[model samples]
Target: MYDAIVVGGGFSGLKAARDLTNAGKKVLLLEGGERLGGRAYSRESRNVPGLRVEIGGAYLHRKHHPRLAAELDRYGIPTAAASEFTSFRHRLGPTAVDQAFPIPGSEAVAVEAATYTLLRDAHRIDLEKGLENQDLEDLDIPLNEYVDKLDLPPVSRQFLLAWAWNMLGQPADQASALWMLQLVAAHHYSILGVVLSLDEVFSNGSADLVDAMSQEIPEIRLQTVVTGIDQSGDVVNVTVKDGHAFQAHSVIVATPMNTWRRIVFTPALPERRRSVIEEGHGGQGLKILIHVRGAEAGIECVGDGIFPTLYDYCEVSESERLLVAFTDSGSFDPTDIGAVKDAVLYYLPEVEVLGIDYHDWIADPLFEGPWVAPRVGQFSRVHKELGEPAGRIHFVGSDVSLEFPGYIEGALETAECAVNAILHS
Candidate 1:
C-alpha cells in the first residue's frame, strides 16, 4: 500500500503528493484529466500560431495569495501584466444605453457607500476565528437583494452587480452575501487592490508551474477517473472507473464537489459530507478566448448581454489579439458562431473575430464546474464542517478552504491541511 493515494491532479492533489513525498512518504496521484494542472490549465494556441492562452484559472494574484506566489517563485517564472485599456468602454446593452459609470470625483465615494454596506458586514467576519459558530445569518442573504438596497444611481448599481457576478461566476441573488464579503476581505480590505492582479499571469504560462509541481511528485497517473473510495481496516482503497484499484494508508480526495458527488464510499460517507455534496457549490460558466482583428486598443465591456463582459487579452500577432470573455450562462454553447457574433457585437461591433478557444467545463464530467462559489446559504451552513476528515479519508479542495477559498491558494492551503492531518494521524 502506498503511504498516501491522492485523487485528482489539480493544484490540491499535486501539492498534497509533493509535500507527502518530501516528508519521506511514498505518494501516488491519480488525475482524471489528460494533464495535471486541473483547473489551472494553460496551452499554446493551436489555431493562432505563436499565441498562448490559459483555458482555465490563469490569473496570478500574489498580493494576498502567498501559496501561489511561493510556487511561482520556486519555478523562477516571471509574470506580465495584461494589456492596459487606453479608454474605458461600457456597453450596458447592444443598443448602447446611457452613461456607463464614468463616475465623477465624489461619485467614487458614493460607489464605496454602496459597496461598503456589504463589505463592512463581511469585515467583521474573521474566517480564521472559525465561521460556523459565528452569527452570520444577518449577512447570509443573497447578494442581489443586498445590492438592490443600494440608493445609488441605476448605472452604478448595475455596474456593481455585474462586477460581482463576473468575479464570482454567479449572479448576486444566487451567491451568498458573505461570499462577496469574503472576496473583498481576501484583498487588503480593498476591492481595487485585488482587481489590479486581474491582468497579471505567469510569464511561461500556467502550465509551466503545473509542470514544476508535477516533477516533484513520486508518481502521477493521468487520464484516470476515480469512481469509488472504500476505507476498511487500516487501508483506504481507491478504485478508478478504468478497472484499476490502489490501496493506501490514507486517501485524499482533492476533487471539486461535483466530481466527488459521483464517488461511492464504503460504509457510506458521513451525513455532513453527503449534505455538502448534495448542496452544490458549483461555479459553472464559459471561459472563451477569441482572437480578434481591428480592435486596436484594449477594451472592457460591462453589459447584460451574451458573454456579459470581456477584456482585451495580449496581442498574439500584428493583426490578431486575444480577448478573454466570460458568460454567466452555464448553457452557452462555446461552438455557436452566431452567439459569438452577437456577443462580440454587443461590445466592439467593429472588431473582427478570426478564431475562438474555449472549454465547456460544466459539460466535463471530471470537472462539472470551473471552481467553487457556494450557493447562497451553502457555505454558511457547511463551511466549517464539510471538509473535515472522515476515518482515513481526507477531503481537500478550494471550495472547502478558509484562506483564499475557491482560488489556487485555497487549493494549496487545503492540501497542506490534509497532508498535515495524515502525517499526524
Candidate 2:
C-alpha cells in the first residue's frame, strides 16, 4: 500500500506525484495512455529541424503564470520566439473577408471605433480580480447576443468573433458572455495579451518541463486503465481493469472531468461531480499542424471552414514554413485533405499544401476535450464545488482553476492546492 495513489500522468497528476514524493510520501502515478505527458505534447512529425508543432496546448506568459515562471527558470528552458504577425487578415464568408482589415480607410472611423471598443471592453475585466460570482450582469449570457446589439458591420463582427470563438474553442452562440469574460480575466485583461498568448510557442516542444519532471520519478504506471475507485470504511481502494487493486490513505483524481464518466465510484458521486461531467466543457476543438510555403508571409488567419483559424508557427527554411490551425470538433472532416485545403484558403487565400498531422483529444478515452470551459449556467451552478474532494478522493486540474482555468498555469495552481490539502490532512 502506498501513501497515495494518483491517477493520470498529465501535468496535473505529474505535479501531484512530484510534490507528494518531495514531502516524503510514497506515491504511485498511473497514466492510461502510452506516453507520460497527457495533452501537453509537441509533434515534429514533418521532419522539420527545430520545428515542433504543438498538438495539445501551446504558449505561456511569464507575467500571467508565476509557477510556470519559476519552473521555466529552474529547468533552464526559454520560450520560443513570438510570431511576427505583420499582417492581420480574416474572412467571415463571401460577404466579408480582409486582405488587411477589410475597411476602406481613407482611414475609416467606424473600423477604428469598433477596434477601440473591443479593446476597451476587454480591459474592463480585472485580471487581478475575477467576476465576484453573480455580481456581474446578464452580459454573462451569450457573446453573440451582446455583439448583435452593437452597431458594427458584419465583417467587423466576424473579425472580433473569430478571436473570442477561437479562444473559447466553441461557437459564439454556444458560449456564454460571462465565461468569455473569464477568458479575458485569465489573460492580462487586454485583448492584445490574449493575442500574445496565442502568437508564441514554448521552448522544447512545450511539454519539456513535464518530461523533466517525469525523468526523476521512479514510479509511473503507463497502460493501466483504472476501472473503479471505491472508498469504504477507513481505506480507499483503486481497482484496475487488469484485476489489480491498490490501497492508499488518499487519492487525487487529477484527470479531467470528461474522463470521470468512464470511472465508477463505489458510493457514487453526488450531483456535483455527475453534473459537471454531463454539462461538458467548451474546448472540444480540433488542432492541426500543416507545412506550407510560397504564399504570403506573416499571416494570421481566422474565418469560416474546416481550418477556421490558423497562423504561421515558424519558418522551416527560406522557402518552407510550418503553420498551425484549428477548427471546432466536427466542423468538417479534419482528416480529409480536400476539406483542409478549402478551410486554409479562408485566410491563406492561395498557398501550397505540403502535409498535415493532428491529434484528437475527444477521440481518445485517456483524455477528453481540450480543457474544461464550463458552459452556460454550468459556471455559476457548479464552479465552486468542482475541486472539492469526495471522501478521500481529491480533484485537481486546470479545468477547475478559477484563475487561468484552461491554461497550463491553472493546472499547476490547482495541483498545488490539492497537494497542500493532502499534506495538511
Candidate 3:
C-alpha cells in the first residue's frame, strides 16, 4: 500500500502528489482521461495549421495568478499581453456598439478598493459571525434577490453579472453573491489590485506548467476509470471498471461533483456532504472558435444571446486567422457554417468565415458543465460543506476554493490548501 493515492491528475491532483512526493511520501496518481492537466488539456487543431488549441479551461490572469506565473517561469514558457485595443462590445437595444479601455496603467488601486470592500464584508458575515455553518435550507431564493435588497444600480448589477458569469461560467442570477464577494476579495488581495490584459493574463498554453509540476513524479496511470470506492476499514479499496481493485492508505476523490456522486461510498458520507454532492450547482458555458477573413479585423463584441460575445479574426501564426466567441448556457447553436458567418457579420459586416469549431461545456460528462459556479442560494448550502474533509479524504479543486473559487487561480489556491493540510497532519 502507498502512503497516498490521488484520484485525479489535473492541476490539483498533480500539485498534491508533487508536494507529497517532495516531502518523501510514496504517491500514486490516477487519471481518468488519457492524459493529465484535467480541464486544462490541449489538442491539435485541424482548423488552424500546425497550431494547438485549448479545448478546456484556458487563460490565466497574471494579476490574479502569481503562482501560475511562477510555474510558467520554472517551465521557461513565454507569455504575451492581450491586445491594447481589446474592446468590450455591448448590445444596448437593437444596436451593437464597442467600448475600448487602454490597458489600465494604475487601475490596480480601483480594483483593490472594490475587492477589499467585498471580501471584508463577506468574511464579517460568514467567518466572524459564524454564519458559515448555518444551513441554507432556504433554496428557493436567487442571488439577485439579495442584490436587489442591497439596492445596487443597474450598471453595477450589469457589471457584476458579466464578471461573475465570465469567471464562474454561470449567469449572475444563478451564482451565490457571498461566494462572488469572497472571490472579489481574494482577487484584490492576491493580485495587488492589478488587472492585466486578457492576452497577457495567460501562457500561450497551460500544458507546460502541468508538465513541469508532474515531471518528477512516477508514472501516472492513464485511461483508468474508477468506478467504485470502498472504505470498509482502516484502508480504502478503489475499484476500476474491469473488476480491478487497488488498495491504499488514503484516497483523494478529485473527480468532478457528478462523477464523485457515482462512486459508491461503502459507509456513506455525512448528510451535509452527501447533500452537497447530490444537489450542488454546475454552471454552464460554451466557447466557439472560428476561422474567418476580411473586414471583421479588429472588433470584439459582448452580448446576452447565443452570439453574445465575439472577437476579431486574429492570427495565431502567419497562416491562420481565427475569431473566438463565447455564449452563456443555452441551446443556442452557432455551428452551422452559414449561421456562424451571419453572426460574425452582425458585428463585423465585412468578414468571411472559412470554417467553425464549437465545444459546449454543458454537455460534457467529465465537467458536467463548465467550472462549478454556485447558484444564488446554493452558496451557503454547498461551498463550506464541500470544503470540509471526510476522514483521510481531502478536497481540492476550483469548486472548493473560497477566493476566485471558479478560476484557475482558485484551483491553485485549493490545491495549496489541501497540500498544507495534508503535510501538517
Best by TM-score: 1
lDDT of 1 by residue, 71-97 (tens): 888888788776676645675433333
Q: Which model, 1 or 2, shows the larger lDDT?
A: 1
TM-scores, all models, native as reference: 0.93, 0.88, 0.82
Candidate 1: segments with Cα more than 4 A from true spot: 92-101, 105-109, 129-131
What local lDDT score does residue 198 receive in model 1, on the 0 to 100 scale? 73
Error of 1 at 275 (Å): 2.8
Any residue pairs clashing in model 2, and if so which? 140-178
lDDT, residue 280, candidate 3: 51
lDDT of 1: 0.77
Tens-digit per-residue lDDT, 1-425, candidate 2: 88899998888888899999989999999788788778788766654655667788777777778888787888787786667666666666555535544544433566677556655665565543444344455556777887776666666666667766677777777777777767765775655576666534576776688887887667988988888889975888999878578889999888877888789987887775577676566665677777887655687777654455787776777888777786677455666888777777766767887877778787787777876655666665556566778889888888778777888888888889889999998
Cα RMSD of predicted structure 1: 2.6
lDDT of 3 by residue, 203-283 (tens): 466677777888977857888877777777788888877647787777777766656776777767767677657765656
Instruction: Evaluate candidate 3 by giving its C-alpha RMSD to the native, one decimal.
Output: 4.7
Give candidate 3's whole-model lDDT: 0.63
